[PDB]
């Protein structure tokens, strides 16, 4: 549309496009997650719930391979039973909503695999810096 050619606009703007197009615009959805006599309690619990959710996400990233790299290749493989689709098709064919509907079952095992991979990389790096 207006943002054709130079593919960007405001946050949640890429939510309709395919995930390959939406992957180039991730900094703003990361950005619009933190900043934004009894009603002060409501304002305060909203603000601390926002920073608690953001800190939980940053801690979930920080125990994995990437602290703030925002795109992280890692060392765990991919079971093809989970996706069971053509690989380059999903980046030109699927929205992130539809993809999250697809792998709703296949969740929370990936995160433990990531933690095992990161702890294995840490003990391997400890051994490597130990014998040197």
């Amino acid at each position: 549309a207006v943002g054709i050619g130079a593919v960007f606009l405001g946050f949640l703007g890429a939510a309709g496009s395919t995930m390959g197009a939406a992957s180039m615009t991730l900094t703003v959805q990361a950005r619009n997650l933190l900043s934004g006599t009894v009603w002060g309690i409501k304002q305060l619990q909203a603000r601390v719930l926002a920073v608690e959710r953001y800190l939980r996400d940053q801690q979930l990233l920080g125990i994995w391979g990437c602290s703030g790299k925002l795109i992280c290749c890692t060392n765990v493989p991919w079971n093809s039973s989970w996706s069971n689709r053509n690989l380059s098709e999903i980046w030109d064919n699927m929205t992130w909503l539809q993809w999250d509907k697809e792998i709703s079952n296949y969740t929370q095992i990936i995160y433990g695999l990531l933690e095992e991979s990161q702890n294995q990389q840490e003990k391997n790096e400890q051994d490597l810096l130990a014998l040197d």
């Binding site: 943002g3 130079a6 960007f8 606009l9 405001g10 946050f11 703007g13 703003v28």
Partner: protein
């Protein structure tokens, strides 16, 4: 229902820093839009200067404008400003503020003739 109105000089000396400012009403600046500046030398066709975005896009201009154009948005005042440093008398043109949307430049400004003369 959007309304764009330019403001600024129409008579400036060459080799100076030109600057307009277009006020926007009827809608918001931070929309799915490129608030743009487009000019037209008199009797000739249009000349797209550049844009700025209400999101977080970096502004991208026409490279023929020789990196002397800085469009700066003012979201606290619903405005966006053209700049043109080191002007010449051949840069005399009608100037236009406009809004690229899902349709192509629906609401323009009225367009004011900046006649650069010494």
């Amino acid at each position: 229902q959007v309304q764009l109105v330019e403001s600024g000089p129409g008579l400036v000396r060459p080799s100076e820093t030109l600057s307009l400012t277009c006020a926007v009403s009827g809608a918001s600046i931070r929309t799915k839009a490129w608030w743009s500046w487009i000019r037209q030398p008199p009797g000739k066709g249009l000349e797209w200067i550049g844009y700025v975005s209400g999101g977080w896009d970096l502004p991208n201009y026409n490279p023929s404008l020789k990196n002397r154009v800085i469009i700066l948005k003012d979201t606290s005042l619903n405005q966006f400003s053209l700049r043109l440093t080191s002007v010449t008398a051949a840069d005399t043109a009608l100037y236009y503020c406009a809004r690229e949307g899902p349709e192509d430049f629906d609401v323009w400004g009225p367009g004011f003739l900046v006649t650069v003369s010494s």
